[PDB]
Amino acid sequence: FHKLVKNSAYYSRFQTKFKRRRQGKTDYYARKRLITQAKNKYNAPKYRLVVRFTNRDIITQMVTSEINGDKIFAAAYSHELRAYGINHGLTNWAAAYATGLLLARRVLAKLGLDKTFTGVEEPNGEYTLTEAAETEDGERRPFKAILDVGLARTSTGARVFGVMKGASDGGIFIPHSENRFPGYDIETEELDTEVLKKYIYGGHVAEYMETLADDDEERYKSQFVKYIEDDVEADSLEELYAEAHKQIRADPFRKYVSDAPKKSKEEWKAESLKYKKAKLSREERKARVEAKIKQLLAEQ
Amino acid sequence: QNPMRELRIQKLVLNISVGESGDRLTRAAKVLEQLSGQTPVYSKARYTVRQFGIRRNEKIAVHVTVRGPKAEEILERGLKVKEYELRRRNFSETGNFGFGISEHIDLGIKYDPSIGIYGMDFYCCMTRPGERVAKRRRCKSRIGASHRITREETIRWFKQRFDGIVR
Amino acid sequence: HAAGLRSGTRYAFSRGFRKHGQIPLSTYLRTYRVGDIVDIKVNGAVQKGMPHKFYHGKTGVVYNVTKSAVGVIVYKRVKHRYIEKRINVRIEHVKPSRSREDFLRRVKENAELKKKAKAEGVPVQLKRQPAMPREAHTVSIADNKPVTLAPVAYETTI
RNA sequence: ACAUACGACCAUACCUAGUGGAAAACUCGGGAUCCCGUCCGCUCUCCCAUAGAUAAGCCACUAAGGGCGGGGUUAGUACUCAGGUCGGUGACGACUGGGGAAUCCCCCGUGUUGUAUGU
RNA sequence: AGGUGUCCUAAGGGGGGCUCAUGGAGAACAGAAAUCUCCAGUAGAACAAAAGGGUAAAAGUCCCCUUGAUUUUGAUUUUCA
RNA sequence: AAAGCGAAUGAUUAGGGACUCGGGGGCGAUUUUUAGCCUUCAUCCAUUCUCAAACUUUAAAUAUGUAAGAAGCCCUUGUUAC
């Protein structure tokens, strides 16, 4: 026998935290340093690049902070990557590079700097940053943005830096260092520059198929069921992604349509109202108490 | 209804409390390695009491944890010594249980006179599938009331699996 | 008897009840320009850039803007003369003031309201006036018959 | 209307117990060669999107629930600014011209909203 | 009613993972009190020193790297002429 | 100032319900590892009588900062090494 800690007085003194911290979706300590700007520059916006990983998707956005909420500049998902010739491994590391490149090309065309700032245009495993492009007898500074990684752990070779690498090659300038890229050896503090190239084009998953097939046939059949059905082999992986990159630059606004059922915007509203539940009125709630009294009284 | 509410062994953790530092403890840690095949971890005395003859920041105990099929096999060896009879008070309100044995060579390790004789303690943790919800870093939450194990359920599982008895 | 920098501020600098913890983040999204009217309110959580306890509650005018702080001008009353004071305050303590909004609202309405009359050709009587004594009116007692009152006798309650 | 990502006010949103969830989404889930990290692939990290299931998370509803928010009463009461050659041995109290609270107790309610994509 | 003539190469600076005091139920020697495991837990713990204020993916705790405890001078606040 | 303690810290009077293995003294053989029958303190829960210059969820009167424009409001567009 001891004090009941959770008594009526405990609730009264309780102070709840922020709603989005209760759900555990945001980190306000880090958020404050990302969005605040020097008061010398009055209304110059700060651009963030947020990346979130789900079970079967990758989400990328360009966000600017405002006093009454956030504003989204341009968004790119992994569903839209199907229209460019990729149908498998939608969440591997190489798929992050593709969707990272799509957003970078998508935003530059919005504000009319697509013709200049072409980028590398031939992917390579080299550590480079976008620089100013000379034009009209002058120098123009590149677009600048920063990376928001949320709550993901930033270890070496994580996919969060794949989107960073893809957008950097698009033409946007994003400051970073190379000590987190795959193929970086902490002992010699040097970057291989060849593992990176292989690891861009899906090489690591290609080696898995050939290695798994010889050692374990049945496991190789179960894990790669959908790869076999569309008879895509390890040798064909590199040319598949290389061709996808070409189509991204040619047309980034190609529309993709899914196989889910489709209706007009208004008809969906009517459908959801069928299954909604109506709150009980005060009169109905009062009437149940008398019914509860009568039946509870009769057992004893 | 019971589609995905079947109990299983989450982990088995077992410890030895030698109670005093020195070469004797090192021999005890030597014993525990071959039983599990993993290096064990020491523990330090956080109090400081003269009656028990221990001080702060001196190693006085060892322990190790195992998971998967290895935990299933090692638990079987321990229950053999207990001949599958446990007392009702060995099950906690959460749904876990444990016991202890006085002699560690009752099951064979090919006894050596140099190492000596030690007494070992047993404890295991039950669980249900999909308990990652309370331990993932992002969007951590609390499991529901209907999805947690009770004391009566786990003893029924123990009797049905090992055909043991409760006193 | 001692005089420290924070002496006597037991209740002034403390946060309220059920208000400890995280600072609302909309504070850092505001903007300031020279000539604005701001008022000072010290926040206990932030321990940098705290003005002296005298200025907790005064109102001033911005005169300088920097990376993370603003300069405010306030008037202090020493015995028999006034003195101009210039202080540096972090933005967590300052706040825009609604002191002048009534004036700025009234000047805008007057300009448009005078414009429409000049086209129409009628005097406006735009400037305000204090409350005037009431005017004559009539009150009917139909279905409102008065009720008579009287004082009550003494009685012991407890 | 509903779902997901980033938000604003920061309990009308929290805590306990019980029922239901079209579509998609979210989740649990399978494997440990490669990157990486542990006593232990528990967590973190990589690969797969087939299969199983809404059991849990999540959403909705119920309870003469605890708490929280708004209002009525207590009350023109307690207190207080100005005034008199006002009462009383004193303690202290009444009146004239003004300002004016707080518990116990009773009633109602249980989140609102901005940008982008999709059901 | 009390305090000061000190102390710190980290008890300063940056970054990352974790959450405290206490209570309930369990396990050979083990007992009020030694080590291990689960659930609840708004700070009831901690932060060199008197007291007051402040802090929960930290300002507490452990781990990794460091010397902004450096150079040249001006404006401003408190005691106040 | 007033107010509050069936609201946190601290002080304080009195009964009731639930409990025994927390301590003390008995009973049925002080049998007692009898959760037997008694009970005196202790503990927990719903109520009750009074307080705080160095306590507080709330909160006056009197006094206190700023503003009430021509040095104002609005439109168009020159300078720069920020």
Side-chain angles (χ1 to χ4, degrees):
Chain A
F1 291 165
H2 221 100
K3 299 288 318 176
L4 173 61
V5 58
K6 276 167 109 161
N7 53 352
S8 64
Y10 169 80
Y11 296 136
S12 182
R13 299 282 288 228
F14 190 70
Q15 163 186 22
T16 73
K17 302 189 180 300
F18 275 12
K19 182 211 214 177
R20 218 161 160 74
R21 168 65 175 108
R22 270 184 277 133
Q23 299 169 344
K25 271 153 182 188
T26 178
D27 180 17
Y28 285 104
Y29 181 91
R31 161 162 176 91
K32 174 255 178 205
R33 286 90 185 281
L34 292 159
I35 79 164
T36 192
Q37 194 178 187
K39 295 306 163 212
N40 291 318
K41 322 151 179 191
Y42 292 168
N43 266 334
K46 274 175 97 76
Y47 290 95
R48 298 148 61 210
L49 165 62
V50 300
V51 287
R52 302 298 189 247
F53 292 103
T54 80
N55 273 306
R56 307 188 288 124
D57 204 349
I58 294 183
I59 316 179
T60 47
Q61 285 156 321
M62 179 74 35
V63 192
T64 65
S65 305
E66 294 294 327
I67 195 159
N68 292 318
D70 270 4
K71 298 308 196 251
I72 294 171
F73 204 49
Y77 296 78
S78 286
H79 318 145
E80 306 174 356
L81 213 61
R82 280 185 141 106
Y84 297 90
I86 301 146
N87 303 71
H88 309 311
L90 277 297
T91 65
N92 62 64
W93 185 103
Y97 189 99
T99 177
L101 180 63
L102 174 56
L103 186 90
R105 297 317 297 189
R106 196 166 274 184
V107 58
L108 289 159
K110 172 156 207 267
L111 56 85
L113 294 175
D114 43 2
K115 308 298 311 293
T116 176
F117 298 124
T118 67
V120 288
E121 84 178 1
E122 52 265 13
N124 192 358
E126 271 169 2
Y127 168 71
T128 48
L129 296 102
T130 312
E131 303 206 10
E134 206 281 332
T135 179
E136 61 182 21
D137 280 2
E139 200 69 26
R140 190 157 174 157
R141 295 195 299 171
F143 194 84
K144 184 174 74 175
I146 49 160
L147 186 68
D148 183 1
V149 299
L151 310 182
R153 173 60 153 286
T154 76
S155 52
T156 306
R159 309 195 293 281
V160 297
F161 304 122
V163 192
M164 170 209 163
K165 179 61 153 164
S168 164
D169 285 356
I172 309 287
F173 163 73
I174 297 169
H176 58 256
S177 294
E178 80 277 17
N179 63 6
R180 250 39 180 179
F181 284 144
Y184 187 84
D185 178 36
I186 205 161
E187 298 295 70
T188 192
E189 61 88 21
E190 197 62 38
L191 184 64
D192 191 48
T193 62
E194 195 275 331
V195 172
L196 190 46
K197 179 173 182 290
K198 154 199 84 165
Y199 214 78
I200 279 172
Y201 285 112
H204 69 300
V205 71
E207 305 193 0
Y208 193 29
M209 284 183 31
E210 54 194 24
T211 296
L212 192 53
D214 80 333
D215 195 24
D216 199 314
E217 193 198 3
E218 51 269 14
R219 209 165 80 169
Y220 160 83
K221 283 186 284 167
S222 86
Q223 305 279 270
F224 294 85
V225 159
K226 279 304 176 315
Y227 276 87
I228 301 299
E229 293 198 8
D230 288 333
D231 66 14
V232 295
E233 297 83 359
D235 288 340
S236 87
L237 273 178
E238 173 160 350
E239 77 258 9
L240 177 67
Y241 280 128
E243 214 281 337
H245 291 346
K246 299 188 55 56
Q247 287 174 86
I248 300 299
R249 292 166 173 272
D251 191 13
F253 289 106
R254 172 174 317 162
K255 186 180 289 293
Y256 163 80
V257 291
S258 66
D259 62 48
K262 292 176 172 59
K263 294 166 197 233
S264 71
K265 189 56 67 76
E266 206 280 335
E267 293 179 354
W268 283 122
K269 171 158 189 171
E271 174 94 340
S272 160
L273 291 203
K274 285 184 212 149
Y275 309 97
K276 216 202 181 66
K277 278 283 289 289
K279 281 198 173 143
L280 260 66
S281 76
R282 175 61 215 275
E283 290 82 19
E284 292 149 54
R285 180 180 332 125
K286 167 157 291 137
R288 305 178 78 77
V289 178
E290 281 97 12
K292 193 154 150 93
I293 276 168
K294 302 297 184 189
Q295 63 82 6
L296 211 56
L297 177 55
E299 292 84 3
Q300 43 74 220
Chain B
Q1 61 163 30
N2 63 7
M4 182 165 218
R5 323 182 47 242
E6 59 89 20
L7 294 81
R8 74 182 59 182
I9 295 185
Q10 195 208 303
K11 57 153 167 194
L12 177 63
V13 61
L14 66 86
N15 71 325
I16 290 155
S17 165
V18 65
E20 61 188 20
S21 161
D23 91 327
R24 182 177 177 204
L25 190 152
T26 303
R27 292 196 267 113
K30 181 68 173 66
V31 152
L32 194 61
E33 171 149 20
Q34 73 284 10
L35 190 166
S36 84
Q38 297 163 7
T39 183
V41 317
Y42 295 140
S43 183
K44 297 222 172 151
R46 172 264 308 271
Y47 262 140
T48 295
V49 285
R50 304 221 41 201
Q51 291 143 0
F52 303 144
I54 71 181
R55 308 217 170 260
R56 254 179 75 165
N57 292 104
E58 57 172 278
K59 304 159 162 154
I60 71 184
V62 70
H63 63 112
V64 73
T65 186
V66 292
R67 281 174 150 102
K70 278 171 51 83
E72 180 70 26
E73 190 261 326
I74 299 179
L75 174 75
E76 177 73 32
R77 305 227 282 260
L79 271 188
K80 182 162 157 316
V81 172
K82 297 296 289 183
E83 60 88 21
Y84 312 100
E85 195 178 35
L86 280 296
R87 265 276 295 113
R88 170 164 286 263
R89 77 179 282 275
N90 284 25
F91 302 87
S92 68
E93 281 76 70
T94 300
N96 291 318
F97 65 93
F99 52 83
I101 60 188
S102 188
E103 58 187 26
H104 83 277
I105 203 63
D106 59 2
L107 70 165
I109 298 90
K110 189 78 182 60
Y111 161 69
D112 187 55
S114 70
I115 303 300
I117 299 309
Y118 295 103
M120 281 205 48
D121 210 336
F122 273 61
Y123 211 83
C124 83
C125 312
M126 270 316 78
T127 188
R128 289 188 198 263
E131 64 94 21
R132 151 185 192 78
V133 172
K135 294 181 176 67
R136 59 194 185 198
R137 168 166 169 100
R138 178 185 192 275
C139 184
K140 179 180 308 177
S141 296
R142 161 187 299 169
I143 74 168
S146 310
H147 199 75
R148 49 176 73 123
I149 315 164
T150 64
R151 174 156 161 173
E152 59 183 333
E153 274 167 51
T154 187
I155 74 177
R156 186 168 325 161
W157 172 88
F158 173 78
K159 291 191 287 185
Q160 187 274 331
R161 154 166 286 243
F162 296 111
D163 322 67
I165 52 171
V166 301
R167 291 291 96 222
Chain C
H1 161 85
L5 183 63
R6 270 184 69 162
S7 61
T9 53
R10 178 174 171 156
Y11 297 94
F13 286 9
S14 88
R15 311 181 71 93
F17 183 59
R18 269 214 286 138
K19 281 168 188 325
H20 316 260
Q22 177 74 252
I23 292 170
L25 212 52
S26 88
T27 290
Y28 314 79
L29 298 192
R30 302 200 183 104
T31 48
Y32 304 102
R33 293 102 185 279
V34 303
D36 312 0
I37 317 289
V38 302
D39 49 16
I40 297 89
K41 163 80 162 302
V42 159
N43 194 324
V46 193
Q47 314 273 259
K48 311 182 80 71
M50 267 199 210
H52 185 256
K53 68 171 177 287
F54 171 69
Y55 310 101
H56 173 79
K58 316 277 171 288
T59 302
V61 160
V62 187
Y63 88 100
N64 185 20
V65 177
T66 49
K67 179 227 295 170
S68 50
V70 294
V72 191
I73 289 190
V74 70
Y75 277 127
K76 186 187 202 182
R77 172 161 172 309
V78 176
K79 48 173 88 73
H80 94 273
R81 66 184 175 305
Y82 278 100
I83 298 171
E84 155 172 323
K85 315 294 298 203
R86 308 181 148 199
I87 66 179
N88 312 308
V89 189
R90 286 221 165 186
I91 65 181
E92 289 92 305
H93 308 300
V94 304
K95 171 175 41 79
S97 52
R98 315 171 55 205
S99 88
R100 205 181 163 93
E101 61 76 10
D102 167 358
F103 170 60
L104 282 187
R105 186 273 304 278
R106 207 160 28 85
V107 56
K108 298 293 187 182
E109 90 75 20
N110 267 329
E112 71 76 19
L113 164 157
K114 163 185 185 161
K115 176 180 90 92
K116 66 168 292 301
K118 204 182 244 173
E120 201 166 80
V122 174
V124 298
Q125 181 258 349
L126 55 87
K127 73 163 54 168
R128 46 198 181 146
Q129 313 264 40
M132 291 305 208
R134 270 180 269 107
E135 291 266 280
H137 50 255
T138 315
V139 160
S140 163
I141 53 188
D143 161 345
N144 203 2
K145 174 92 141 163
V147 295
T148 318
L149 296 195
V152 291
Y154 185 63
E155 177 177 319
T156 300
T157 186
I158 68 164

